Amino acid sequence: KIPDPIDRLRRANLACEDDKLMIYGLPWMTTQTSALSINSKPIVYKDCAKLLRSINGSQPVSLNDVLRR
Amino acid sequence: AIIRQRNDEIPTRTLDTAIFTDASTVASAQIHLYYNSNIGKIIMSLNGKKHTFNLYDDNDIRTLLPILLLSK
């Protein structure tokens, strides 16, 4: 197959582990990884969980859910 | 069609989202995205400047995904 590079990211989703912003749902990683800021630093934010819920509510949100809008 | 339609998989409209400018600093942002599916690259327009993300590079992926996933 000729791949669509987006396809392997379609199940990605965000989660807060305490103040650390993480990315779940990436198949080739066997472990979750940290989300990075625009200056390449792991995101650590005191209001992490409230920020996530401010955006999506309680409903979980994957990249596929974003792309079907 | 096939590449053309692949490029259209990413929206062309304005995205209202949030961007972490530092490890602990966040602000609202409105952006536009373009996708070239031939080589796997996304170009983002932010504050009138261009940013590029290689979808085969894990560090770029970890930088782009929070911007897409916090969009409303």
Residue numbers in the entry:
A (entry chain B): 60 to 128
B (entry chain A): 40 to 111
From the primary publication:
Eventually, we solved the sub-complex structures at 1.8-Å (for P21 space group) and 1.5-Å (for P31 space group) resolutions using the single-wavelength anomalous dispersion method, respectively. The Rwork/Rfree values were refined to 0.202/0.221 (for P21 space group) and 0.190/0.206 (for P31 space group), respectively. Because protein terminus residues are much better traced in the electron density map for the structure with the P21 space group than the structure with the P31 space group, description of the structural elements below is based on the P21 structure unless otherwise specified. The complex structure, within the crystallographic asymmetric unit, contains G3 (amino acids A40-K111) and L5 (residues K60-R128) in single 1:1 binding mode. As can be viewed from the overall structure, G3 and L5, with good shape complementarity, are stacked together to form a globular fold. G3 consists of four anti-parallel β-strands (β1-β4) and two α-helices (α1-α2), assembling into a compact structure (Figure 1(F,G)). Helix-α1 intersperses the β-sheet on the lateral side. L5 is composed of three anti-parallel β-strands (β1’-β3’), two α-helices (α1’-α2’) and one 310 helix (η1’) (Figure 1(F,G)). One conserved disulfide bond is observed between C75 in β1’-strand and C107 in α1’-helix to stabilize the structure. On the whole, large surface areas are buried in the sub-complex, which are calculated to be ∼1606 Å2 for G3 and ∼1553 Å2 for L5, respectively. The extended binding interface can be further subdivided into three binding patches (Patch1, 2 and 3) based on the G3 elements involved in L5-engagement. In comparison to the other two patches, the third patch therefore shows the best overall structural complementarity, the largest number of participating amino acids, and the most diverse types of inter-chain contacts (van der Waals, hydrophobic interactions and hydrogen bonds). Taken together, a total of 15 residues in G3 and 18 amino acids in L5 are positioned along the binding interface, providing extended inter-molecule interactions for sub-complex formation (Figure 1(M,N)).
Unlike most other members of enveloped viruses that utilize one or a limited number of viral proteins for entry, poxvirus encodes four (A26, A27, D8 and H3, protein names refer to VACV) and another eleven proteins (A16, A21, A28, F9, G3, G9, H2, J5, L1, L5 and O3, protein names refer to VACV) to mediate attachment and membrane fusion, respectively. For the eleven fusion associated proteins, they are proposed to assemble into a large machinery, called the entry-fusion complex (EFC). In this study, we carried out structural characterization on VACV G3 and L5 proteins. These two EFC-component proteins, have been previously shown to interact with each other to form a stable sub-complex, and show highly conserved amino-acid sequences among orthopoxviruses.
